[PDB]
């Protein structure tokens, strides 16, 4: 399965998705969390 929104996984063959730190968001499964663009915000660590 792909990582749920708010989670990322940048390694192969793992069984856990890691949560993205504050200031970054992430849609459905992605290699890395992408920083919020200029002018927008994300407070928590489960930000999607």
């Amino acid at each position: 399965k792909p990582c749920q929104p708010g989670r990322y996984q940048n390694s192969i063959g793992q069984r856990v998705c890691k949560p993205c730190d504050m200031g970054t968001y992430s849609r459905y499964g992605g290699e890395l969390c992408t920083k919020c663009p200029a002018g927008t915000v994300a407070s928590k660590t489960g930000s999607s």
């Binding site: 192969i12 063959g13 793992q14």
Partner: protein
């Protein structure tokens, strides 16, 4: 008749006060966070 002994030199004011203290100096720049560890390999099969 001749005048009296002329007066002395009058004193100066009682001198002003000192300057108050300064504000609290600001804080150091907020340090940055560390680097993400490398991408680990696959777990044991």
């Amino acid at each position: 008749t001749s005048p009296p002994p002329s007066p002395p030199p009058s004193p100066p004011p009682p001198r002003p006060p000192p300057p108050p203290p300064p504000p609290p100096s600001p804080p150091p720049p907020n340090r940055s966070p560390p680097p993400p560890p490398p991408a680990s390999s696959a777990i044991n099969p």
